[PDB]
A paper describes a structure:
A central part of the bacterial flagellar motor is the MS-ring, which is composed entirely of multiple copies of the FliF subunit. Major functions of this ring are to support the assembly of the switch and to stabilize the assembled motor.
MS-rings containing 33 subunits represented ~80% of the population (49,944 particles). The 3D map of the 33-mer RBM3 had an average resolution of 2.9 Å, with local resolutions between 2.6 Å and 3.4 Å. We therefore built an atomic model into this map. At a global level, each RBM3 appeared to exhibit the same fold as previous models. As a minor note, residues 395–401 of RBM3 in the 33-mer were associated with clear density but were not included in the previously published models. The correlation of these densities with the stabilization of RBM3 residues 395–401 potentially suggests an architecture with discrete membrane-spanning domains.
Residue numbers in the entry:
A (entry chain A), B (entry chain B), C (entry chain HA): 228 to 307, 354 to 438
The structure:
């Protein structure tokens, strides 16, 4: 089981780099040792390939390309009446064509979850007090930008403020 | 039975890493030695392959691509009446096509279950008392983010608060 | 897992170069050590190929090229009346054609996120005060130009002003 052992080490490095990035950005604002963050990562390890072929529509006559055409009219009016109208048409077309071949990578990030806790000092000498809502929102925005939120990917973030021991 | 012996070791490492992650995040809030967590993991070890082929629909004329077409009208009005309308049409199309080949990985996580117990101190010198509902909710959210909840996957979490010995 | 280890190092260099560029441009305005910035990057590592083939339309007669043509009129007026008009036409065309083959690069930037924090001095000796809106807008514009905003790509920027410790 050598493959699984190496895979676990790779996932540890991804989380380690993100963890210290959040610590570094928030360290000056709150303090050197008043922030803690833990990051868990889910990685895709499957091998995938994809081939796509697309054709541009040519229903409209203005945007159509023709290689050959045949077109015959027959029309006989009779009096003394009959009207034997007749029409035949054959058309050949040259169409646009696009092909993309994609071989995806192994080790991408599928989803991330980060939890951050901050301390209660709030004062030089008085009793600890909760932080302001605006400051909490600023901290949330900064850690969100640091970690790389993507709503469509499915990221989750949770930050709580509580006293330390 | 060398394969099964190595498989058991791999499952132990996955649970070990998750266990200390929950301990580290919750250690400052409650204390150094006032938290205990145990993690059990179910791993998929089957070999799977999959091939998918998809075609884009072309029922609508506006989004259709044509290589050739034949179309003949015949229409004879007679008087003295008969109306022998006739129509023939033959069409050929060029269709989009996409192929993905996927070879899945061995050793993924199918489901996780974690149980966490926290202590009763609640006071410097008085008798132990239960923790607050808000603090319990914060602890639950933090451990959920640390462990990586996924509702569709089937994860289960249970946290209880009780005295220690 | 040697490929993933090297990939992580490459992403670190991209963020490192951008980080010091923002620091250098904003250093004289605010101060030597009154600015902090952290950059996270998402890189595409997939292998992709694409082939495109396009044909210019030739529906209009003025912009059409002909290699051969056949065209026969028959028209019989009878009196004592019948009018047996008849028309046949066959046309061949020479069409324009363009082919581009593209092999994309590996390691491009898909999206960037930067968070910047600035300090409160605002005075030589008095209490710290918030910076002006115009100065904040100037700082935002300068860091945006330094980092390389692209609206269609999906870039995100967040700058907040708060006291330091």
């Amino acid at each position: 089981r050598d493959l699984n052992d190496a895979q676990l080490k790779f996932a540890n490095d991804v989380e380690s780099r993100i963890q210290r990035r959040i610590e570094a950005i928030l360290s000056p604002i709150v303090g050197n040792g008043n922030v803690h963050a833990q990051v868990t990562a889910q990685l895709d390890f499957a091998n995938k390939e994809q081939t796509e072929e697309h054709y541009s529509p040519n229903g409209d006559a203005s945007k159509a390309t023709l290689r050959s055409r045949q077109l015959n009219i027959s029309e006989q009016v009779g009096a003394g009446g009959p009207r034997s109208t007749q029409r035949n048409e054959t058309s050949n077309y040259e169409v646009d064509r696009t092909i993309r071949h994609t071989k995806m990578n192994v080790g991408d990030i599928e989803r991330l979850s980060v939890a951050v806790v901050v301390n209660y000092k709030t004062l030089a000498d008085g009793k600890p007090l909760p932080l302001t809502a605006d400051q909490m929102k600023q901290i949330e925005d900064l850690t969100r930008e640091a970690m790389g939120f993507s709503d469509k990917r499915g990221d989750t973030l949770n930050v709580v403020n509580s006293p330390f021991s």
